[PDB]
PDB file of all heavy atoms in Angstrom:
ATOM      1  N   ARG E   1      76.784 103.696  99.494  1.00  0.00           N
ATOM      2  CA  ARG E   1      76.584 105.056  99.000  1.00  0.00           C
ATOM      3  C   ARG E   1      75.711 105.900  99.925  1.00  0.00           C
ATOM      4  O   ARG E   1      75.966 107.097 100.097  1.00  0.00           O
ATOM      5  CB  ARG E   1      75.995 105.041  97.588  1.00  0.00           C
ATOM      6  CG  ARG E   1      77.032 104.791  96.513  1.00  0.00           C
ATOM      7  CD  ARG E   1      76.433 104.940  95.126  1.00  0.00           C
ATOM      8  NE  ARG E   1      77.428 104.690  94.087  1.00  0.00           N
ATOM      9  CZ  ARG E   1      77.519 103.553  93.407  1.00  0.00           C
ATOM     10  NH1 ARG E   1      76.674 102.564  93.656  1.00  0.00           N
ATOM     11  NH2 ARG E   1      78.456 103.406  92.483  1.00  0.00           N
ATOM     12  N   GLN E   2      74.685 105.315 100.536  1.00  0.00           N
ATOM     13  CA  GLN E   2      73.888 106.133 101.439  1.00  0.00           C
ATOM     14  C   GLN E   2      74.669 106.447 102.712  1.00  0.00           C
ATOM     15  O   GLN E   2      74.471 107.508 103.318  1.00  0.00           O
ATOM     16  CB  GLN E   2      72.560 105.447 101.735  1.00  0.00           C
ATOM     17  CG  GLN E   2      71.659 105.424 100.501  1.00  0.00           C
ATOM     18  CD  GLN E   2      70.311 104.765 100.736  1.00  0.00           C
ATOM     19  OE1 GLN E   2      69.828 104.681 101.863  1.00  0.00           O
ATOM     20  NE2 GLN E   2      69.710 104.265  99.660  1.00  0.00           N
ATOM     21  N   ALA E   3      75.566 105.546 103.126  1.00  0.00           N
ATOM     22  CA  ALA E   3      76.298 105.762 104.367  1.00  0.00           C
ATOM     23  C   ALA E   3      77.302 106.901 104.234  1.00  0.00           C
ATOM     24  O   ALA E   3      77.455 107.704 105.163  1.00  0.00           O
ATOM     25  CB  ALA E   3      77.004 104.471 104.793  1.00  0.00           C
ATOM     26  N   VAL E   4      78.011 106.984 103.112  1.00  0.00           N
ATOM     27  CA  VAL E   4      78.963 108.081 102.936  1.00  0.00           C
ATOM     28  C   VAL E   4      78.180 109.389 102.919  1.00  0.00           C
ATOM     29  O   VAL E   4      77.477 109.694 101.955  1.00  0.00           O
ATOM     30  CB  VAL E   4      79.812 107.938 101.668  1.00  0.00           C
ATOM     31  CG1 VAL E   4      80.558 109.233 101.400  1.00  0.00           C
ATOM     32  CG2 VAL E   4      80.787 106.787 101.822  1.00  0.00           C
ATOM     33  N   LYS E   5      78.311 110.159 103.990  1.00  0.00           N
ATOM     34  CA  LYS E   5      77.504 111.354 104.160  1.00  0.00           C
ATOM     35  C   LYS E   5      78.289 112.644 103.999  1.00  0.00           C
ATOM     36  O   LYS E   5      77.683 113.722 103.998  1.00  0.00           O
ATOM     37  CB  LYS E   5      76.777 111.307 105.511  1.00  0.00           C
ATOM     38  CG  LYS E   5      75.792 110.136 105.556  1.00  0.00           C
ATOM     39  CD  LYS E   5      74.890 110.139 106.774  1.00  0.00           C
ATOM     40  CE  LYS E   5      73.895 108.981 106.705  1.00  0.00           C
ATOM     41  NZ  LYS E   5      72.973 108.950 107.875  1.00  0.00           N
ATOM     42  N   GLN E   6      79.605 112.574 103.816  1.00  0.00           N
ATOM     43  CA  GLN E   6      80.354 113.788 103.541  1.00  0.00           C
ATOM     44  C   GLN E   6      81.666 113.479 102.844  1.00  0.00           C
ATOM     45  O   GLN E   6      82.243 112.401 103.007  1.00  0.00           O
ATOM     46  CB  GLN E   6      80.623 114.568 104.829  1.00  0.00           C
ATOM     47  CG  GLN E   6      79.598 115.633 105.094  1.00  0.00           C
ATOM     48  CD  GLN E   6      79.969 116.512 106.262  1.00  0.00           C
ATOM     49  OE1 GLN E   6      80.184 116.035 107.379  1.00  0.00           O
ATOM     50  NE2 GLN E   6      80.171 117.791 105.981  1.00  0.00           N
ATOM     51  N   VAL E   7      82.111 114.450 102.050  1.00  0.00           N
ATOM     52  CA  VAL E   7      83.380 114.409 101.341  1.00  0.00           C
ATOM     53  C   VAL E   7      84.096 115.707 101.689  1.00  0.00           C
ATOM     54  O   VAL E   7      83.681 116.785 101.244  1.00  0.00           O
ATOM     55  CB  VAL E   7      83.187 114.263  99.824  1.00  0.00           C
ATOM     56  CG1 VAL E   7      84.526 114.219  99.105  1.00  0.00           C
ATOM     57  CG2 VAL E   7      82.347 113.027  99.516  1.00  0.00           C
ATOM     58  N   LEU E   8      85.137 115.618 102.513  1.00  0.00           N
ATOM     59  CA  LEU E   8      85.787 116.787 103.089  1.00  0.00           C
ATOM     60  C   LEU E   8      87.254 116.872 102.693  1.00  0.00           C
ATOM     61  O   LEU E   8      87.927 115.855 102.506  1.00  0.00           O
ATOM     62  CB  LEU E   8      85.682 116.788 104.618  1.00  0.00           C
ATOM     63  CG  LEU E   8      84.290 116.989 105.212  1.00  0.00           C
ATOM     64  CD1 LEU E   8      84.327 116.752 106.706  1.00  0.00           C
ATOM     65  CD2 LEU E   8      83.821 118.407 104.915  1.00  0.00           C
ATOM     66  N   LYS E   9      87.735 118.105 102.544  1.00  0.00           N
ATOM     67  CA  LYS E   9      89.165 118.329 102.421  1.00  0.00           C
ATOM     68  C   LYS E   9      89.837 118.089 103.767  1.00  0.00           C
ATOM     69  O   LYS E   9      89.342 118.516 104.816  1.00  0.00           O
ATOM     70  CB  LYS E   9      89.456 119.747 101.938  1.00  0.00           C
ATOM     71  CG  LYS E   9      90.929 120.097 101.949  1.00  0.00           C
ATOM     72  CD  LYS E   9      91.522 119.815 100.578  1.00  0.00           C
ATOM     73  CE  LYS E   9      92.874 120.467 100.389  1.00  0.00           C
ATOM     74  NZ  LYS E   9      93.495 119.998  99.124  1.00  0.00           N
ATOM     75  N   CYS E  10      90.972 117.398 103.742  1.00  0.00           N
ATOM     76  CA  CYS E  10      91.592 116.915 104.963  1.00  0.00           C
ATOM     77  C   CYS E  10      93.101 117.091 104.874  1.00  0.00           C
ATOM     78  O   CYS E  10      93.677 117.108 103.786  1.00  0.00           O
ATOM     79  CB  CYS E  10      91.249 115.448 105.221  1.00  0.00           C
ATOM     80  SG  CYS E  10      92.281 114.673 106.467  1.00  0.00           S
ATOM     81  N   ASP E  11      93.730 117.263 106.033  1.00  0.00           N
ATOM     82  CA  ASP E  11      95.184 117.376 106.099  1.00  0.00           C
ATOM     83  C   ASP E  11      95.635 116.908 107.476  1.00  0.00           C
ATOM     84  O   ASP E  11      95.389 117.586 108.477  1.00  0.00           O
ATOM     85  CB  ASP E  11      95.648 118.802 105.821  1.00  0.00           C
ATOM     86  CG  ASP E  11      97.156 118.933 105.813  1.00  0.00           C
ATOM     87  OD1 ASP E  11      97.848 117.959 106.175  1.00  0.00           O
ATOM     88  OD2 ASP E  11      97.652 120.013 105.436  1.00  0.00           O
ATOM     89  N   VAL E  12      96.301 115.753 107.521  1.00  0.00           N
ATOM     90  CA  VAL E  12      96.681 115.141 108.786  1.00  0.00           C
ATOM     91  C   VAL E  12      97.755 115.930 109.525  1.00  0.00           C
ATOM     92  O   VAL E  12      97.968 115.678 110.718  1.00  0.00           O
ATOM     93  CB  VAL E  12      97.125 113.691 108.530  1.00  0.00           C
ATOM     94  CG1 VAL E  12      96.271 113.060 107.424  1.00  0.00           C
ATOM     95  CG2 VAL E  12      98.595 113.630 108.166  1.00  0.00           C
ATOM     96  N   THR E  13      98.425 116.863 108.852  1.00  0.00           N
ATOM     97  CA  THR E  13      99.511 117.642 109.433  1.00  0.00           C
ATOM     98  C   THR E  13      99.044 118.905 110.155  1.00  0.00           C
ATOM     99  O   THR E  13      99.892 119.706 110.560  1.00  0.00           O
ATOM    100  CB  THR E  13     100.531 118.045 108.361  1.00  0.00           C
ATOM    101  OG1 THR E  13      99.920 118.956 107.436  1.00  0.00           O
ATOM    102  CG2 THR E  13     101.011 116.819 107.600  1.00  0.00           C
ATOM    103  N   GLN E  14      97.743 119.135 110.280  1.00  0.00           N
ATOM    104  CA  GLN E  14      97.217 120.348 110.897  1.00  0.00           C
ATOM    105  C   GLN E  14      96.608 120.066 112.265  1.00  0.00           C
ATOM    106  O   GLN E  14      96.064 118.984 112.516  1.00  0.00           O
ATOM    107  CB  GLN E  14      96.168 121.013 109.998  1.00  0.00           C
ATOM    108  CG  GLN E  14      96.693 121.563 108.679  1.00  0.00           C
ATOM    109  CD  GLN E  14      97.626 122.751 108.875  1.00  0.00           C
ATOM    110  OE1 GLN E  14      98.811 122.695 108.547  1.00  0.00           O
ATOM    111  NE2 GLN E  14      97.081 123.842 109.407  1.00  0.00           N
ATOM    112  N   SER E  15      96.704 121.070 113.147  1.00  0.00           N
ATOM    113  CA  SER E  15      96.087 120.979 114.470  1.00  0.00           C
ATOM    114  C   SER E  15      94.642 120.525 114.355  1.00  0.00           C
ATOM    115  O   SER E  15      94.173 119.692 115.140  1.00  0.00           O
ATOM    116  CB  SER E  15      96.179 122.322 115.185  1.00  0.00           C
ATOM    117  OG  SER E  15      97.467 122.897 115.045  1.00  0.00           O
ATOM    118  N   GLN E  16      93.910 121.101 113.396  1.00  0.00           N
ATOM    119  CA  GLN E  16      92.599 120.588 112.992  1.00  0.00           C
ATOM    120  C   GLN E  16      92.743 119.922 111.630  1.00  0.00           C
ATOM    121  O   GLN E  16      92.704 120.606 110.598  1.00  0.00           O
ATOM    122  CB  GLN E  16      91.502 121.665 112.921  1.00  0.00           C
ATOM    123  CG  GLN E  16      91.094 122.362 114.213  1.00  0.00           C
ATOM    124  CD  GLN E  16      91.771 123.675 114.470  1.00  0.00           C
ATOM    125  OE1 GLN E  16      91.374 124.685 113.888  1.00  0.00           O
ATOM    126  NE2 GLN E  16      92.745 123.695 115.367  1.00  0.00           N
ATOM    127  N   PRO E  17      92.883 118.597 111.565  1.00  0.00           N
ATOM    128  CA  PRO E  17      93.102 117.966 110.254  1.00  0.00           C
ATOM    129  C   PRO E  17      92.008 118.303 109.259  1.00  0.00           C
ATOM    130  O   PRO E  17      92.298 118.523 108.076  1.00  0.00           O
ATOM    131  CB  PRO E  17      93.153 116.471 110.589  1.00  0.00           C
ATOM    132  CG  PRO E  17      93.530 116.414 112.036  1.00  0.00           C
ATOM    133  CD  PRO E  17      92.862 117.607 112.657  1.00  0.00           C
ATOM    134  N   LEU E  18      90.755 118.384 109.708  1.00  0.00           N
ATOM    135  CA  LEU E  18      89.621 118.669 108.836  1.00  0.00           C
ATOM    136  C   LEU E  18      89.262 120.149 108.797  1.00  0.00           C
ATOM    137  O   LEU E  18      88.149 120.494 108.390  1.00  0.00           O
ATOM    138  CB  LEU E  18      88.406 117.844 109.262  1.00  0.00           C
ATOM    139  CG  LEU E  18      88.594 116.332 109.206  1.00  0.00           C
ATOM    140  CD1 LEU E  18      87.336 115.607 109.644  1.00  0.00           C
ATOM    141  CD2 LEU E  18      88.944 115.958 107.779  1.00  0.00           C
ATOM    142  N   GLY E  19      90.168 121.023 109.217  1.00  0.00           N
ATOM    143  CA  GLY E  19      89.914 122.446 109.068  1.00  0.00           C
ATOM    144  C   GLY E  19      88.860 122.930 110.043  1.00  0.00           C
ATOM    145  O   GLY E  19      88.903 122.631 111.244  1.00  0.00           O
ATOM    146  N   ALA E  20      87.902 123.699 109.528  1.00  0.00           N
ATOM    147  CA  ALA E  20      86.845 124.308 110.324  1.00  0.00           C
ATOM    148  C   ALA E  20      85.527 123.544 110.294  1.00  0.00           C
ATOM    149  O   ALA E  20      84.573 123.967 110.952  1.00  0.00           O
ATOM    150  CB  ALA E  20      86.610 125.749 109.861  1.00  0.00           C
ATOM    151  N   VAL E  21      85.436 122.450 109.544  1.00  0.00           N
ATOM    152  CA  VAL E  21      84.191 121.695 109.420  1.00  0.00           C
ATOM    153  C   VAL E  21      83.805 121.064 110.753  1.00  0.00           C
ATOM    154  O   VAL E  21      84.587 120.285 111.319  1.00  0.00           O
ATOM    155  CB  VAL E  21      84.301 120.618 108.329  1.00  0.00           C
ATOM    156  CG1 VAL E  21      82.979 119.877 108.187  1.00  0.00           C
ATOM    157  CG2 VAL E  21      84.712 121.248 107.009  1.00  0.00           C
ATOM    158  N   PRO E  22      82.625 121.359 111.295  1.00  0.00           N
ATOM    159  CA  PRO E  22      82.244 120.757 112.575  1.00  0.00           C
ATOM    160  C   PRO E  22      81.709 119.347 112.379  1.00  0.00           C
ATOM    161  O   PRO E  22      80.974 119.064 111.430  1.00  0.00           O
ATOM    162  CB  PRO E  22      81.149 121.698 113.087  1.00  0.00           C
ATOM    163  CG  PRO E  22      80.476 122.162 111.829  1.00  0.00           C
ATOM    164  CD  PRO E  22      81.550 122.211 110.750  1.00  0.00           C
ATOM    165  N   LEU E  23      82.095 118.457 113.290  1.00  0.00           N
ATOM    166  CA  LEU E  23      81.605 117.087 113.310  1.00  0.00           C
ATOM    167  C   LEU E  23      81.529 116.646 114.758  1.00  0.00           C
ATOM    168  O   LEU E  23      82.317 117.114 115.586  1.00  0.00           O
ATOM    169  CB  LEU E  23      82.523 116.133 112.530  1.00  0.00           C
ATOM    170  CG  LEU E  23      82.806 116.318 111.036  1.00  0.00           C
ATOM    171  CD1 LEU E  23      83.926 115.368 110.626  1.00  0.00           C
ATOM    172  CD2 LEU E  23      81.574 116.122 110.157  1.00  0.00           C
ATOM    173  N   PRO E  24      80.615 115.740 115.100  1.00  0.00           N
ATOM    174  CA  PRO E  24      80.659 115.124 116.421  1.00  0.00           C
ATOM    175  C   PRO E  24      81.872 114.225 116.551  1.00  0.00           C
ATOM    176  O   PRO E  24      82.401 113.738 115.539  1.00  0.00           O
ATOM    177  CB  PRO E  24      79.360 114.309 116.468  1.00  0.00           C
ATOM    178  CG  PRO E  24      79.078 113.981 115.047  1.00  0.00           C
ATOM    179  CD  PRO E  24      79.556 115.173 114.250  1.00  0.00           C
ATOM    180  N   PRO E  25      82.350 113.993 117.770  1.00  0.00           N
ATOM    181  CA  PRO E  25      83.462 113.057 117.969  1.00  0.00           C
ATOM    182  C   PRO E  25      83.162 111.703 117.341  1.00  0.00           C
ATOM    183  O   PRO E  25      82.059 111.167 117.470  1.00  0.00           O
ATOM    184  CB  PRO E  25      83.583 112.965 119.491  1.00  0.00           C
ATOM    185  CG  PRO E  25      82.990 114.233 119.993  1.00  0.00           C
ATOM    186  CD  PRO E  25      81.896 114.596 119.034  1.00  0.00           C
ATOM    187  N   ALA E  26      84.136 111.177 116.606  1.00  0.00           N
ATOM    188  CA  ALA E  26      83.963 109.914 115.905  1.00  0.00           C
ATOM    189  C   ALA E  26      84.013 108.727 116.863  1.00  0.00           C
ATOM    190  O   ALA E  26      84.707 108.747 117.883  1.00  0.00           O
ATOM    191  CB  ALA E  26      85.047 109.740 114.841  1.00  0.00           C
ATOM    192  N   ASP E  27      83.225 107.697 116.538  1.00  0.00           N
ATOM    193  CA  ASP E  27      83.356 106.418 117.222  1.00  0.00           C
ATOM    194  C   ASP E  27      84.611 105.676 116.770  1.00  0.00           C
ATOM    195  O   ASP E  27      85.098 104.802 117.497  1.00  0.00           O
ATOM    196  CB  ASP E  27      82.112 105.553 116.993  1.00  0.00           C
ATOM    197  CG  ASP E  27      80.848 106.175 117.566  1.00  0.00           C
ATOM    198  OD1 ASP E  27      80.618 106.043 118.789  1.00  0.00           O
ATOM    199  OD2 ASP E  27      80.088 106.800 116.793  1.00  0.00           O
ATOM    200  N   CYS E  28      85.115 105.988 115.575  1.00  0.00           N
ATOM    201  CA  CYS E  28      86.302 105.352 115.017  1.00  0.00           C
ATOM    202  C   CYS E  28      86.968 106.289 114.024  1.00  0.00           C
ATOM    203  O   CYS E  28      86.319 107.161 113.440  1.00  0.00           O
ATOM    204  CB  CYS E  28      85.988 104.027 114.317  1.00  0.00           C
ATOM    205  SG  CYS E  28      87.466 103.235 113.632  1.00  0.00           S
TER     206      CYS E  28
END
């Protein structure tokens, strides 16, 4: 529970799957 740090709307079919939400590049 402490590790889950965000709950975002997502769509794999979009150029930006996560919309406009900024995030650092994922390790995985």
Side-chain angles (χ1 to χ4, degrees):
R1 280 186 180 101
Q2 291 181 23
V4 168
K5 296 188 177 181
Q6 265 188 303
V7 180
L8 292 171
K9 173 94 165 172
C10 166
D11 183 352
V12 324
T13 66
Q14 294 293 116
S15 316
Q16 295 96 79
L18 299 180
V21 182
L23 300 170
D27 297 279
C28 180

